Swiss-Prot record, chain B:
Organism: Homo sapiens
Keyword Disulfide bond among record annotations: no
Illness association: Glioma: Gliomas are benign or malignant central nervous system neoplasms derived from glial cells. They comprise astrocytomas and glioblastoma multiforme that are derived from astrocytes, oligodendrogliomas derived from oligodendrocytes and ependymomas derived from ependymocytes.
Keyword Phosphoprotein included in the entry's annotation: yes
Result of altering residue 1 to I: Found in pediatric undifferentiated soft tissue sarcoma samples; uncertain significance; somatic mutation; results in global decrease of H3K36me2 and H3K36me3 levels and increased H3K27me3 levels
GN (gene name): H3C1
Effect of residue 1 to M: Found in pediatric undifferentiated soft tissue sarcoma samples; uncertain significance; somatic mutation; also found in a subset of human papillomavirus-negative head and neck squamous cell carcinomas; uncertain significance; results in global decrease of H3K36me2 and H3K36me3 levels and increased H3K27me3 levels
Protein's UniProt name: Histone H3.1
Assembly and oligomerization: The nucleosome is a histone octamer containing two molecules each of H2A, H2B, H3 and H4 assembled in one H3-H4 heterotetramer and two H2A-H2B heterodimers. The octamer wraps approximately 147 bp of DNA. Interacts with TONSL; CHAF1A; CHAF1B; MCM2 and DNAJC9. Interacts with NASP; NASP is a histone chaperone that stabilizes and maintains a soluble pool of Histone H3-H4 dimers.
Lineage of origin: Eukaryota, Metazoa, Chordata, Craniata, Vertebrata
From Swiss-Prot, chain C:
Modification type N5-methylglutamine: residues: 94
UniProt name for this protein: Histone H2A type 1-B/E
Domain of life: Eukaryota
Residues carrying N6-glutaryllysine: 85, 108-109, 115
Keywords annotated in UniProt: Acetylation, Chromosome, Citrullination, DNA-binding, Hydroxylation, Isopeptide bond, Methylation, Nucleosome core, Nucleus, Phosphoprotein, Ubl conjugation
Cellular localization per UniProt: Nucleus; Chromosome
Modifications made to the protein after synthesis: Monoubiquitination of Lys-109 (H2AK119Ub) by RING1, TRIM37 and RNF2/RING2 complex gives a specific tag for epigenetic transcriptional repression and participates in X chromosome inactivation of female mammals. It is involved in the initiation of both imprinted and random X inactivation. Ubiquitinated H2A is enriched in inactive X chromosome chromatin. Ubiquitination of H2A functions downstream of methylation of 'Lys-27' of histone H3 (H3K27me). H2AK119Ub by RNF2/RING2 can also be induced by ultraviolet and may be involved in DNA repair.
Subunit and partners: The nucleosome is a histone octamer containing two molecules each of H2A, H2B, H3 and H4 assembled in one H3-H4 heterotetramer and two H2A-H2B heterodimers. The octamer wraps approximately 147 bp of DNA.
Cross-link (Glycyl lysine isopeptide (Lys-Gly) (interchain with G-Cter in ubiquitin)): 3, 5, 109
Gene Ontology annotations of biological process type: chromatin organization; heterochromatin formation; negative regulation of cell population proliferation; protein localization to CENP-A containing chromatin
UniProtKB/Swiss-Prot annotation, chains F, H:
Chain positions with Phosphothreonine modification: 65
Designated gene of the protein: H4C1
Result after altering residue 20 to W: In TEBIVANED3; results in early developmental defects when expressed in zebrafish embryos
The name this protein goes by in its record: Histone H4
UniProt modified residues of type N6-propionyllysine: 1, 16, 29, 62, 64, 76
Keyword set includes Repressor: no
One GO molecular-function entry: protein heterodimerization activity
The species this protein was found in: Homo sapiens (Human)
Residues with N6-acetyllysine modification: 1, 16, 76
Residues found modified as N6-(2-hydroxyisobutyryl)lysine: 1, 16, 29, 44, 62, 64, 76
SS bond partners: none
UniProt PTM comment: Acetylated as part of spermatogenesis progression prior to histone-to-protamine exchange. Demethylation is performed by JMJD6.
Keywords: Acetylation, Chromosomal rearrangement, Chromosome, Citrullination, Disease variant, DNA-binding, Hydroxylation, Intellectual disability, Isopeptide bond, Methylation, Nucleosome core, Nucleus, Phosphoprotein, Ubl conjugation
N6-crotonyllysine: modified positions: 1
Gene Ontology CC terms, in alphabetical order: CENP-A containing nucleosome; chromosome, telomeric region; extracellular exosome; extracellular region; membrane; nucleoplasm; nucleosome; nucleus
Swiss-Prot record, chain G:
A GO term from the CC aspect: nucleosome
Subcellular location: Nucleus; Chromosome
GO biological process: antibacterial humoral response; antimicrobial humoral immune response mediated by antimicrobial peptide; defense response to Gram-negative bacterium; defense response to Gram-positive bacterium; innate immune response in mucosa; killing of cells of another organism
Modification type N6,N6,N6-trimethyllysine: residues: 59
Sites of N6-(2-hydroxyisobutyryl)lysine modification: 8, 17, 20, 31, 59, 82, 90, 94
Species name: Homo sapiens (Human)
Protein name (database record): Histone H2B type 1-K
Main location: nucleus
Phosphothreonine: residues carrying this PTM: 89
Length: 99, 100, 119, 84, 99, 87, 98, 87
DNA sequence: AACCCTAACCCTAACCCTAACCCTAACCCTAACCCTAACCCTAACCCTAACCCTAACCCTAACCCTAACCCTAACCCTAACCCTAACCCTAA
DNA sequence: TAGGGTTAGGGTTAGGGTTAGGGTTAGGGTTAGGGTTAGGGTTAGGGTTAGGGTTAGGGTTAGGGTTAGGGTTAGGGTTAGGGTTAGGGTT
């Protein structure tokens, strides 16, 4: 009775904060949170599945940024991988340069 | 009676428009809760389906049939006909890579 | 434990950069995750969630509603050529279909007169 | 529940035309209605058999929604939504 | 004088039977070696191709082409025609899903 | 210093006889005249796509040579597994 | 020579023994070994691969015998499945005895 | 010898400062960052269009050298009329 | 039946070879543990079944208008020899 | 870089296969009335689960030996060229 409650984990708080930068004024109905939380879990299982084959073919044992970047160049198409390799490079540059 | 008897072909081009702008499900729910349970009795006896897995089979067997029908229509307009015929559905499957 | 600063904030990314490290490590994708990979992979997911969630809102104003419901998601991932060549096999839960009637069958056109007795 | 013929006759002639009119077809020949009851029975046999194989692995006797979302994913037609 | 001109379309049935019973590649190696070299220049310059890489590319490319022509033929026999044409190739690619 | 021709073979070598030899294996009996320009447009969008993924693997190892195991690895992703040309 | 080549591993010795048991007077060319050695290394990635996912969904952390019997009932067709699920258990039974 | 030919890096040959000196003669005060790629698109279409008409006159005379009274005879048709570098 | 193509060899002669032979490297027995898939009440919820209704939806005729099909020619275009002699092989 | 043989590359020509037109008839389309079944509710009781301590055997793991698999190599056993003979009809 007391507690005995499992904690389901979902990326739904973080998809209600990217709707509040791109378009303040609009809100997502419960089904759209469904058809979204099942998108984030599908482009994270296609970039950690072409980066665990690239590490092994080259006989190396760690997924460094270059490997998570070769996948974006192959799996995403044009005018989508171009606007994504740059977005990552600025975001990691801040991590090392700025502490 | 001088009414508005619509000529063959004007109550079918108003139907394609109404049904292509809606999100509901065409197949009736109760007759599709018995096709699913008579194809399960053979594989294992006494299988009890959940109430959200008899609506995830309806929404994946009503979105593959509205997929064969667009491919049948492109094929039946390649022989100069406007009526889909049973020798069209069979061609669509072969090229797609399904039954042969 | 002197003070708490989220690893997402130091790199200025909204999507979690701590959760993606556990999920990469506990799924047995590879032996040693590295530390330049959780941050790169929490930014190639956020750009994509900001392409569907902005090409879908713009299709909600057009139909005069203030919520991005399931159909407005199909009218935004079945138009853009880059996003219809990635999600090209996926089926949205209650999406519907994109309007298209082939021109050859449009009403009359060749004109249904047939024998047209006369000339 | 039943084992008769109402299973494949449940997909009645009106609802095997409305599914088509959502695709563009303007005139439907009489024998399309029989062939399109055959193609749906084969698809359901293949999706349902794979859900049963996953259900037996955990020993459960209930075919939950996630199992159907994992049967469809293997054959190349992922579903997004009715599950996680 | 013996013209011995077989009527139109009967030399080809002999050609189809003999060709379907052997495995030698039908596009010449020296010309193909160059088409790959031109299509590689844009992606990077200074790329050196090992002998096997050109050979594999010839076996896959012949195999995609041999197939598209068995499906174009199936489409042609449907319209009552007996010869492939430019329009038939585009129905096979829309249906197969390549677009 | 430079081959005077810089055409890099402009979709050439696929001469009328080669496209009339591949089609005959297929079953085609009466090839029509316009097919030859089109079949040099379909080969073209294929040889590029195996190649773009092939270079992408080699630059990952930093090597400058496209070995056949790279072409067999690229061909699996698109959908057709060539068996043995490289192994 | 002085290279100390790392060298490679091939299931080519094993294929020859099986050829002898089924037919005792034919032989295989080297090009044919190449197609066969690849197949033995491509039905070891599909059959093992479905086992890895079947472990995670359940939450269990080991790939034991049942998980390679629910991956041969899914990734193999119709009557090459009943004749391979049955063949495998017989070898597991013998190993347990000895 | 000269074992190299002109690649396609030339379109980026126009530097970032040169597009900031042909725009400060225009009255522009605060050039935005994305303009540099667009101004390499407008120049790129123009240089081809004067060029195709220039080659088409030279091939009429069966020569192999594009002399300036050919550029001046192409530039009149499109719209401008350079007076000076030509007769 | 103009007179065209199909089917025995048979020399010809390189690549599958069994060794065979080292020998290098990877498995196996032999000792340590830990950890988890077994185990169990329970208490909870949720699927199944049963009952009632009623009103939108299917069903089954009639009438008649197109569209699918079968001829009809015919006339453009794709087939089948023929001197090349250009270019791709083949070493080296 | 020779060099050489054959593959592609040009012409004609006649047939045959699209292609356009012109009738003929069943076949979908389009309304209009009867006869339901497929939806909703409400109960209720059994039918399958969700944690939770608790063993004990099945793993891992780090030492030895040692066996089995992976390179190199003459000389024979197919195996194709290479010509006759065969053999199919085929215009």
């Amino acid at each position: 009775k007391k507690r005995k409650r499992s904690r389901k984990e979902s990326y739904s708080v973080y998809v209600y904060k990217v709707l509040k930068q791109v378009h303040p004024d609009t809100g997502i109905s419960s089904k759209a949170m469904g058809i979204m939380n099942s998108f984030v879990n599908d482009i994270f299982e296609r970039i950690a599945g072409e980066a665990s084959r690239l590490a092994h073919y080259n006989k190396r044992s760690t997924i460094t940024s270059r490997e998570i970047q070769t996948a974006v160049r192959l799996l995403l198409p044009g005018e989508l991988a171009k606007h994504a390799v740059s977005e990552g490079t600025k975001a990691v540059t801040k991590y090392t340069s700025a502490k | 009676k001088k009414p508005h008897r619509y000529r063959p072909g004007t109550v079918a081009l108003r139907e394609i428009r109404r049904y292509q702008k809606s999100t509901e499900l065409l197949i009736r729910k109760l007759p599709f809760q018995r096709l699913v349970r008579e194809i399960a009795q053979d594989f294992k006896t006494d299988l009890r389906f959940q109430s959200s897995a008899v609506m995830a089979l309806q929404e994946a067997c009503e979105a593959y049939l509205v997929g064969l029908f667009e491919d049948t229509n492109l094929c039946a307009i390649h022989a100069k006909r406007v009526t889909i015929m049973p020798k069209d559905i069979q061609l669509a499957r072969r090229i797609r890579g399904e039954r042969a | 434990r002197a003070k708490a600063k989220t690893r997402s904030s130091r790199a200025g990314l909204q999507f979690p950069v701590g959760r993606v490290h556990r999920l990469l490590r506990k799924g047995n994708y590879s032996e040693r995750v590295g530390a330049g990979a959780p941050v790169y992979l929490a930014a190639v997911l956020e750009y994509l969630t900001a392409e569907i969630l902005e090409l879908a809102g713009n299709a909600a104003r057009d139909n005069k509603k203030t919520r991005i419901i399931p159909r407005h998601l199909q009218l935004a991932i079945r138009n853009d050529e880059e996003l219809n060549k990635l999600l090209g096999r996926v089926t949205i839960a209650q999406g519907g279909v994109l309007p298209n009637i082939q021109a050859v069958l449009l009403p009359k056109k060749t004109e249904s007169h047939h024998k047209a007795k006369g000339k | 529940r039943k084992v008769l013929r109402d299973n494949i006759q449940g997909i009645t002639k009106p609802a095997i035309r409305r599914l088509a009119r959502r695709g563009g077809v303007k005139r439907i020949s009489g024998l399309i209605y029989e062939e399109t009851r055959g193609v749906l029975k084969v698809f359901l046999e293949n999706v349902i058999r794979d859900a049963v194989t996953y259900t037996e692995h955990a020993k459960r006797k209930t075919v939950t929604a996630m199992d159907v979302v994992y049967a469809l994913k293997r054959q190349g037609r992922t579903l997004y939504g009715f599950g996680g």
